[PDB]
Amino acid sequence: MGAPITAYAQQTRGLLGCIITSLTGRDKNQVEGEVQIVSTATQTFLATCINGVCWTVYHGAGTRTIASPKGPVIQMYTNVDQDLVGWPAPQGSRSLTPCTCGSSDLYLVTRHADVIPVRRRGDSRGSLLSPRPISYLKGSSGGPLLCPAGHAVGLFRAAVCTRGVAKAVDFIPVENLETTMRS
Amino acid sequence: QVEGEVQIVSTATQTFLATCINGVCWTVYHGAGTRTIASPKGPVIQMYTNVDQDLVGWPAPQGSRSLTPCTCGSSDLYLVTRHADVIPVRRRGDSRGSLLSPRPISYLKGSSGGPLLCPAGHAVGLFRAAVCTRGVAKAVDFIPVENLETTM
């Protein structure tokens, strides 16, 4: 997209339609956006579409198929170690592009559509410039960490917390996405 | 049922902008003055007025959502006009910023009170006044969110 990074969320399915769709694996709803709010029967998290593939955390999706208008879709990539899974990005979604500029200042887009700044402290870490309670970050696993330009740097994976307040976030840099595709 | 962070407000003589930041609806004193804001329940008065910092604020109206203050100190600001145009600005100082591409003063007209966002869409400041040479606005003056946070 561009800058400033602004985002909004839209719920499209309730608890009961979700359960039915999970089982039938057939979802006829229209898709829009680059980040899909996604849920299994055990949990809800995010999935980001980068370069035509809809990526998310393996610790969230497992090896599950994604419900699509044509029935369940099998994963294209699975990598228990990189903690990634990816399905062909759903029809109607828009994809992000990897960050081709190595920016040190990253922006995490939460499940509640909040863009919070994080300072990179290494290939897969960034200090949350404004510490938030863990509860707030919950549900954002698989979300994108954008550079100022609106490009994917990584996917939110885990929170670095203490006393229930996260001051940093562990993420999966887009680098692992490519290596996961090569594998 | 969308909610706006920026309200396009107007008095009898003029029109400008207001920006909800932290539950308060802020705007420039030289636009509102001590004027009270309209509500479907009648006029509601300013919670804050500060002629000095050119800042006034009433409680956020309906159909509004608050902006989050900036917490990254970025200098790559973005000004939103009353037409919803975004203008890239580089922070030249506490309350000063240089447009990355000057625009005719008319282009920024009526946007005073609007927000100056950081790369994350957070409130950096509130557009105070355009600083122009001849007919072209090259830079802008703005009320930092700290003033607002301070006023609260």
């Binding site: 969320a9 839209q10 999970s22 709803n29 829009e32 996604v38 994604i66 887009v109 | 037409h83």
Partner: peptide
């Protein structure tokens, strides 16, 4: 196992807009 299901979306491509008075 059960399929992962899309229950919503987050749109980053939106740009400021005057909310339509309808």
């Amino acid at each position: 196992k059960g399929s992962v299901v899309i229950v919503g979306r987050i749109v980053l491509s939106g740009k400021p807009a005057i909310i339509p008075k309808k």
